[model samples]
Structures are given as C-alpha cells and as structure tokens.
Target chain A: ASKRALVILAKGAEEMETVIPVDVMRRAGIKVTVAGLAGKDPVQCSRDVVICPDASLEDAKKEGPYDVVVLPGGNLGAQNLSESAAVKEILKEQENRKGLIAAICAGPTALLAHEIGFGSKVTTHPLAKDKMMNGGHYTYSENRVEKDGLILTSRGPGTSFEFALAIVEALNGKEVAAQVKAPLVLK
Target chain B: ASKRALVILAKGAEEMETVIPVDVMRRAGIKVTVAGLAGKDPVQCSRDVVICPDASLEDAKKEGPYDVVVLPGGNLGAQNLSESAAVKEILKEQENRKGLIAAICAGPTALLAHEIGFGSKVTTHPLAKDKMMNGGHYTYSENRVEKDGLILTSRGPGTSFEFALAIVEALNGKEVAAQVKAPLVLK
Candidate 1:
C-alpha cells in the first residue's frame, strides 16, 4: 500500500507551501489528503487563493494515522493551526506513534504552539525566526530544509520544492524523490 | 492601479502551476484574476486540488485587456486550453495588443494550437518539444524561463518561481520583482 499523508489546510495558509507538498507527494506516489481545518468548505489562503480541501480534518482524522502530518504556513494559517485543539491532539497522537511531522515557513510555529518535537533542530521562514525562537525550545537552523529526525522543516516559498522533495525522500526514498524532482525542472 | 493578470484556469490544470503563479503574482502586488475556463464552478485540477476561480473566463475576459494572460499546464489542462475557442480568442487578443502572454509546462502548446506568437523563441516541458515543434512555427528554447518579445514560456513546476518572477519583472520592473523574490526564500 502507498504511504498516506495528511496535509492540514487552514484559512490563511500559504497556497504555494500547501500545494507543492501535496502535488510532489502525489507525484512520488504517496496518497496525500488535503484536509481543511474548518469543515469541507473552501479555504481562503494567505494570498486569497481558495482551495477546496479533499476532506475536513474532523473526517480525515478518523482515517488516520497518516504516515506524515504536514503543516503549511502563512502567518495567519499557522496561527489558526496553533489555536486548534484538534490540531494539538493530532500532533500529540502523531508524535506518540513516532510518525513524521513536517512543517514549512511559519508552519514550525504551530509545532511550538502544540508543543510537538521540542529540541529538534528546525527552521522557519526568516521572518518567522523570532516567533519560532521564543523561549528557545528548539534549536533553529538556517538550512533551506532542516530535518532533525522526523521533524522536517523548511524555510519559505523559495524552499517549498526542496521541502516537498525532502518529504518525498523521507517517505519514498532518494531515488523516487529524484525521479519526481527531475520533471519539475528545479534549479 | 496595480498591473492586472488574467490567469485562465481549467479543469485538469496542474494545481501547483496554477497556484504558485497566482500566489507569487499577488505577492508582487499584481491584481490577478483566476478565471475559470469552463465558467465559475470549482475547477478540479490535475492532482485533484480543486480551485474556486475568482470569476469565469467569460466574465474575466470582459474585464481585459489585462497586462498579462497566464496559462498553467497539465496534459489534460493544456489539452482543454488547446481545444477552447474562448482561449484562442483570448490569446489572439492578448497578442494583438502586444500584451505579455505567459505559459508553462505543456501550456505553450495552447499558443501553438491558437497560432499565436509564431516565430517567437519559446519553450515548453521537455516532453512537449515535439508537439510544439511539429510545424517549426516558433523557435524552441531550453532556458528554464524564456521570453521573446511579449511571449513568456517556462519549463515545469520547479521553474515556476523563475517564471513568475520573470513576469513580475516584465510588468512591474526589476525592483519590484526583486522585492517580491527576496521573501520567497528561493535558493
């Protein structure tokens, strides 16, 4: 069976960060579900792109445990994720199961909010570093894509391809990731 | 007033190609309309990412002539564009006005289908070379992003950022494009 991924989509999510991973993961033959944070209604992303989620988080959670739980960040999107009690439970459960948890841009802030994977070396969008570093719970790195064990993180929109490819590499393997990357025409 | 962009969105469109440009364009302060080629209903993209267009193409075309007309590609999406009388008219009008018309991946095939920008240097996804070159109507380019006069073309998903930035540069000037590029965290 293909590895399954759950990408939580919230209002104010960075559209690029959200779509890149989902598309790249699918290209890598992973079954990825883009679950809306609210209900099944369309999500208005940070830049005002409206994305219809594959399923609502409430419903998608029942179908878990996913191999990875992905968080795509916009300042407001991460804020929404940070405040969701459901998200807290999901992250907690995923952590307990030792599943991969990946976040990008402002996404890692949600990890801090949910208290997931503290002490893992991580990274966030440069603008988000101050917020992510508060209390110094995690060692921040400037790597375009950062992975400390299963807590994979990446910088921002510029790093989205790298971030998604990293997730593909982790779940599928370097060969599958390379195959998928070649067609994307990445620099 | 901001420079306006008309992005024609069709069913089976590559969602990453569609959203990345839309998001990045908005970041560059372009007034972009995500227009549904088949009317205003939600578009189910190539990877099953459904996008709600800002307006129907019929409605959006009425709001033109825009600064640029964008076509995002998936095999089926490009085929849909290739087959559209509406797209043909739009592309012809944009070219007649000497406006920028940009496409990526298999998207440039629609230009060929519509017989727009003949003799211009263009590029498409490597797989699309034969179809685009069938008639020798336009010179093919291997550049990740290629511009010949008002016709801008790009390869695939990985080069989306460069393609988008090039459009931003064309319409808004390099200073604005650079300002936009900085935050994207591109390597």
Candidate 2:
C-alpha cells in the first residue's frame, strides 16, 4: 500500500511551505492528509488565506500511526505547533520508527523545541537558525533538503523542489525521487 | 487608499506560486483579492487542496482596474490563464495604462502569448525563455526582479521576496519597499 503522510496545518502557516510538498507527494502517488489543530474552523495561512483541514490533530492521531508527519513553517504556526501537547506526543511516539518527520523553514523550530532533533543534524529557514540552534547541531546548506536519520528539514521556499523530492525518496524510493527530479532538470 | 493586487486562481495552479506571493504581499500590507476564472467554485492548486476565491472574474473585473495584476507561474496554471479571455482582457487593459502587471516563472508565457510584450522587454521563469522568444524581444536576468516600464517580472520562488518588493515599490514607492525589505535583510 502507498505510505500515508500527514501534513499538519495551523493558523498562520506558511502557505507555500505546506502546499508544495503536498502537491509534489501526490504527484508521486503518496496519500497526504492535511490535519489542522483542534477546532473545525478553516486555518489561515500567513497571508490570511483559509485552508480547510481534512481532519483535526486529535482525529489525525487516531487515524494515524502515519508513515510520516510533515510540518510547514510560519513564525506563528511553528510557535503554536511546538506548544501543542498532542502534536509533541505524536512526534515523540513516532520517533525512530520507519516513519519520517519533516519540517521546513520555521517549522524546524517546532521540531527543535519538541526535542525531536536531540542529536540530529538539521537545517531551517535562514532566519530561524538562532532559534533552531538551541536544539541540535545545525548545518546551513542551500540544499532544498537535509536528512538526518528519519527527520528531514529544508531551507525555505526556494528549496521546495528538493524538499519534496526528499520525501518522495523516503516514501517511494530513490528511483521515484530521481524520476520527479528529472522533470525539473535539477542538478 | 491601500493599493490592491489580484491573484488569479484556476484549476491546477502551482500552490507555492500562488500562496507565497499572497502571503508575502499581504504581509507588506497590500490588499490582495483571490479571483477565480468564472464562478466562485474553490480552485484546486497543484496539490489537491482547494483555495476559495474572493470573487469571480466578472466581479473582479468590475472591482478592477486594480492597481496591479499579479500572475504566479506553474505549468498548468500559466497555460490555463493564457487561454482565459478574461485574463487576456485584463492584460490588454493593463497594457494601455501605467498600472503594473507582473508575472513570474511560466506565468509570463501567458502575457507574451497575449501580445502584451509587443514593444516591451520581458523576463520569465528561466525555463520559459524558449517559449518567450516566440512572443517578443526578451532578456534573461538572474536578478531577482526586473522592471521594464510598469511591467515587472521575476524568476521563481527564490525571487518571491524580490517580486513582492517590486510590487510594493510600484504601489507605495521605494521607501516603503525598502522598509519592508529591511526586516528580511534582503540585499
């Protein structure tokens, strides 16, 4: 069966960071669910665009022992996600399994705060380093993606293509990642 | 009065191309209206996620003659927008005035095809050069943003900040644009 990836959304989420990977994953045939924080109201992204969630975090935890959990970054969204007990619990439970945990830009700050990057090398949006530095050794790369164990982190919007390909590689295999990358002609 | 920008949404729009600018522009305090091609049905971007429109094309046109019309590029969204009579009309009208019309990536293809670049110099997503060549005299620039008259264009996601800054410059002048760019420390 195709592996399931849960994309978590929250108020003030960075719209591009969240949506790009979801689209790229689906193109590669992975099933993605956009889960929101508690409450059914549509979550607003950084620009104030409202996105309806497929399910709530509580519902997602119930429906998942998901293969992967993806978080997109916005300053506010990262702050809220890191503070959510339920989200932290899910990440803690998924630690070190075949499942992957991914975050990009400010999203990695949430992972750092949640203690998900204890010894893992990670990267985040350039502006986020000061905050993300507290959790683990951080490396700065223009690379769209960085993988340390099962946790994946990306730079920012510019690295989205690479970010999506990393997820595709993890879920479907390197072959699938190559196939997707071929179309974009990325080096 | 706050300057207004229009984001056109249609099926298969690249999610990042649409959302990043909307997010960035709104953050800059520019009023953005997400407009649909026809009716108000929620439009699906590159991912399966649907983004509802603030108004329909007919209504948006009436609301218009907006200060700026911004087009985000994805392969399919650009293609569809190029084919839309409403979009073509908007371009034609904008060409006659000093109002800014900006496109990024492949979005410029539509503008070129609509003969919006007949006497104008234009730039587009790097991959779009071959297609753009067929339309008019075009220049290639690695620079984040390029302005020729009131028309502005940028490369891709990496250039979103530059693109947003250009819009702010056009609407509110360079000082405000510089102020907005200051926080991001954009060069």
Candidate 3:
C-alpha cells in the first residue's frame, strides 16, 4: 500500500513550510491530505497567502491512521496547534501507533506542549530554542534536520526541502528520495 | 518607496515555486501580489495545492508598473503563460521599463515564447533546456540562479531559496537580503 501523510493547515501557518512538504511528499508517491485545522475553507497564512485545504480535520481524522502527520510552523500557527485539544489527541494517537511525526520551525514546540517524545533530541528555528527547551524535556541539536525515532523536526523555510526529503527517505526509502531530488536542481 | 512584485499565478503553476518566492519576498519587506491568470479565484497548482490569488491579473495590472514581475514554473503553467496575449504585453512592458522580470524552471520558456530577452543568458530546469533554446535566441547556463541584466532565471524547487534571495538583493540590496536570510536558517 502507498504511504499516506496528513498535513494540518492552520491560520497563520508558514505557507512555504506547509506547501514544500506536501508537494515533495506527493512527488515521492505518498498520498498527502492537507487538512484544514479550522474548517474546509481558505486558510490565510503568516504572509497572507491563502490556501484552500483538501478537507477539514474532523473529516480527515476518520480516514486515519496515516503513515505520517506533518506540522508546519509559524509562531502563531504553532501556538494555535499547541492550544488545540483536537491536535493533542491526534498527535497522541499517532505516537501510540509509532507512526512518523514530522515538524518544522516553531512546529516542534507543539510536541513540547503536547508532551510527546520527551527526551528525544530535536531541532527548531534558532529563535524557538528557548521556548522548546522551557521544561528541559527534550535535548536539542543544531542539525538542519533531526530524526530521533518517530519524532522528526527541522529548522525554518530554508531547510524545508531537506526536511521533506528526509520524510520521503524515511517512509519511501533513499532511492525514491534521490529520484525525487534530482530534477529539483538542488546544490 | 517599498518595492512591489507581481506574481502571475496560473492553473498548474508549481506550488512550491509560487509560495517560496512570495513568502521570502514578503519577509524581505517587499509587497507581493499573487495574481490569478484566469480570474479572481483559487488556482489549482501542479501538485493540486489550491492557492487563492490576491487579485486577478486584469485587476493587478491596473495598479502597475511594479518593480518586478515573477513567473513560477510548471510545464502547463508556463504553457498557459506562453499562450497568453496579456502576459506577452506585460512582459514586453516590463522589459521596456527596465524592470526585473524573473522566471524559474519551465518559466524561462515563456520568455522565449514572448521574445522578452533575446540575446541574454538564462537558465531553466534541465528538462526545459531544449524548449528554451529552440531558436538559439539566448545563451544557456547551468547556474542554480541566473541573472542577465533585467532577466532573472532559476532551475527548480530546490534553488527557490537562492532564486528568491537574488530577487530581494536586486530590489532591496545586500543588507536587507542578508537580514531576511538569517532567520530562515539557510546553509
């Protein structure tokens, strides 16, 4: 069966972070569902780009369990994700199932909020380190992308391509990742 | 005065190419307008990402002349761009005004179609080289991002960051580009 990925899209999410992973994952043959955190409507991102989600979270949850749950970041978007009881439940369920959970930039801070993957080494946008380390529950690294078990995290928009390819390499393997990477003209 | 950009978004435009530049340019404090090529509605991108345009190209052009005109690439999207008489007029006008006109991947092929920058050096996604060089109108290079006078071109999704920062440097100078690049955590 083809791997499936669920990407949660919320108001104020970083559009670049959200789009890069979804597009790259699809290229790797992952069935990607971009679920609206609010509802099945247009989402206004951090920079004001509007994206219409594929389905609402409520509807998408019924289709689980996906092979991966992707969380993209903006300071406000992560705050919204951290505050959602529904998101907490989803993350908890995915963790229990040992499915991959990938996040980027401020997105990983939500893991700290939900108390998932404690003691795992993680990385985030430099500005988010203090907030992510607030309770000392997770060790931190400066790597561009870090995957410690099922918990995968990355930096900011700059590292989104590397981060997405890592998710592809994990679920679909290195050959698929390399094949997908070639035409992208990466340095 | 703040620099303003016009990004023409057509159906099948590469979502990553569209969003990355728009987001990065916004981070650089440039005003960017994602204009729908079809009309004032949501556009379905190459990978099925739905993006709601800020305005219709017809409406956006009324407010021009912008500091730059950006064209993102996907085969179909570039074909749509190449076929548009409206796009031809806009590119010709931008060239006449000496404003920067940027394209990526299959995007430079549109420039060739419109005869916007004959005799300038350019680059495109490797697969697009034959189409862009069809008439030997322009010289080609393998640089990740290529800038020949007013024409700016880049390869594909992987070089988007470099391509966007180049646009920032062109409009806002090195200091602004450097400052914007820092938080993105680029290598």
Candidate 4:
C-alpha cells in the first residue's frame, strides 16, 4: 500500500516547516496532502508566504485513514491548531488506529492540546517546551527528531529535514529514506 | 535602509529550497519579494506545492536594485531560469552592479547559463556538478555554502539554512545572522 501523509496547514503556519516535510515526503514516494486548516483559501504563513493547499481539512478528512498526520509549527499556527475540534477528532482517530502522528516545532504542542499519545517521549522547539509541558503530560527530549512508538516530533525549522526523513523511514524503510536523503546534501 | 531580496519563483522549483531561505531571510528582517517568473499566477512547484508569488518577475523587475537576488532550484526550475532572457537580464544587471546573487542546488547552473560569475568559487548539488562545471568557467568548492566575492552558492535543499544565513550575514552582518540563527534551532 502506498503511504499517505496528511499535512495540516493553517493561517500563520511556518512556511518552511510546512513545505520541507511535504516536499521531502514526496521524494520518498509518500503521498502527501497539504490540507488547509481554514476553508480552501490561501494560507498566510507566519513569515507571510502564501500557500494554496490541496484541500480543506474538512475535505481531506473524507480521504482519511492516512498513514500519518503531520503538524508544522509557527506559534500562531499551533494556536490555531490547538483550538480546532476537527484537529482533535483527527488526532484521536489517528491515535485510536495507532497511525503515526508527527509534528515539528510548536506543532507537538498541538498533540498536548489534543491529548493524543500522552506518555510518548517527544520533543519540540525549545521555546515551545514550557507550553507543551504545561501539565507535565509528557517527557521531552533535546534530540532534533524524537520518535517514541508512533508519535514523532522534532525541534524547529532547522530540524525539519530530519523530521521528514524520520517519517519517511517509519513508513517507507531506511533504504528509501537514505536514497531520498542523498541528493538533499544534508550533513 | 532595510535590505531587500528578490527571490525568483518558477514552475517546478523545489518548494523546500524556495521556502526555507525566504522564511529564514525574513526572520533576519530582510524584505523579501517572491516574484514569479510566469506572471503573477500561482506556481506549481517541483513537489506540486502550489505557491502564490508576491508579484510577477516583470513587475518586480521595475522595483529593483535589490540587495540580493535568490534562485532556488529543482532540475526543471533551473532549466526555466536558465532559458529566460528576462532572468538573464536580471542576473547580468545584478552581476554588473556587484549585487549579491545567491543560488542553491541546481539553481547555480543558471549562473553558468547566464555567464554571471566566472572564476568565482561555487557549489551546487553534487549531482549537478557536471552540468555546472561544463567549461570550468567558475572554480568549484565542496563547501556547504560558498561565497566568493558577491557570488554565493550552496549545495542541495539540506544546506538551505546555511545558504540563507550566509546571505543574512553578507547583508546584515554577523551579529544579525547570529541572532537569526539561534531561533531556528539548527544544528
């Protein structure tokens, strides 16, 4: 079966965090859907880059049972994601199915907000650590990319390539991940 | 005066390569104009991410004397940039004025096509070395990011942060670059 990833995009999303994983996953041959958090409109990211998503989260949900659901962070983007009942339901459903749930930067804080994968050790951009640890719900790591079971998380925009590569390795296998990584010129 | 950067966007551009530097440079307080080569319409990138550019290259050209002109790469994107008389004019003008010209991955091949910076040390995605070294007009470097005089070039998508930060340092100084680098959580 082809691996599928649903990458949720929101107003104020980190454009780099959002685009890097989506771009790299496709390189690993994973089917990625860039789904808008708002209705199907251009997403104005934190740095003000405008991106047109493939579909709205409402529509993307119809095509679900995705192998993974990814969250990319900007402070405001994660805040928008935190308040979404739709995102909550999506995370719950994905968690119930034990599908991989991956997030980066402040994105992992959304997992805390949604109460998905409560005890899995994870990581987030250090500036987001205090908020993500609000109730001490999960242990945190300093690693650039951390995966505990099916819940995966990473640090800031710098770690995005690693985050995506881990997701690639998770669903596609190490050989494919290595093959995809070679041309990227990552140290 | 605030520094300005003009990033030329084209169909089939690598979304990660395109977004990372724009996002990072914006973080460094550079005014970035993402100009589409194909008018003002949305660009369909190499990974099929649709991005709405800030303006068309024709329109953006009138607004220049920008401090830097950035080229982001995908194989096809580089080819499109390489073939454009408009892009050639932009590169030639920027080169003649000694303005910084930064290109990453296959993007550097456009410099070869336009005859922008001969004898400058440069780097490109390893796979693109043969095409970039066609006549050895430019000396090659294996550095992640190479800046020889006003010409700057970097390796693949993986080296984008280094590439962007180098530009930031070039225009804004080391202090500003260090400040910008910290928040990114880069290794």
Residue-level lDDT for A107 in candidate 3: 99
* All candidates in order of DockQ, best leading: 3, 1, 4, 2
The top-ranked prediction according to lDDT is 3
List the candidate 2 regions with Cα displacement exceeding 4 Å.
A39-41, A96-98, A112-117, A123-146, A155-162, A172-187, B124-146, B154-162, B169-187
- Candidate 1 CAPRI level: high
Q: How far does residue A76 in candidate 1 sit from its true spot (Å)?
A: 0.3
The CAPRI quality class of candidate 2 comes to: acceptable
lDDT of 4 by residue, A1-187 (tens): 7999999999989999999999999999999999999989999999999999999999999998899999999999999999999999999999999899999999999999999899889999999999999899999899999999999999999999999999999999999999999988898
Q: Please identify which of the two predictions, 2 or 4, would achieve the higher TM-score against the true structure.
A: 4
Q: What's the C-alpha lDDT at position B53 in model 2?
A: 78
Q: Which sequence of candidate numbers ranks them by lDDT, best first? A: 3, 1, 4, 2
Tens digit per residue, CA lDDT, model 2, A93-177: 8885657999988898887777775777788877888898863456554455789889898877657667888889988999887
DockQ of 4: 0.91
For B1-187, candidate 4 gives per-residue lDDT tens digits of: 8999999999999888999999989999999999999999999999999999999999999999999999998999999999999999999999999899999999999999999989999999988999999988988899999999999999989999999999999999999999999989988
**How would you order the candidates by TM-score, starting with the best?**
3, 1, 4, 2
Task: Report residue A141 deviation for candidate 2 (angstroms).
Answer: 10
Model 3 lDDT tens row, A1-187: 9999999999999999999999999999999999999989999999999999999999999999999999999999999999988899999999999999999999999999999999999999999999999979999999999999999999999899999999999999999999999988887
TM per prediction: 0.99, 0.80, 0.99, 0.99
TM-score of chain A of each: 0.99, 0.91, 0.99, 0.99
Preferred candidate (TM-score higher): 3 or 4: 3
Looking at candidate 3 chain A, the ten consecutive residues that score lowest on lDDT are A178-187
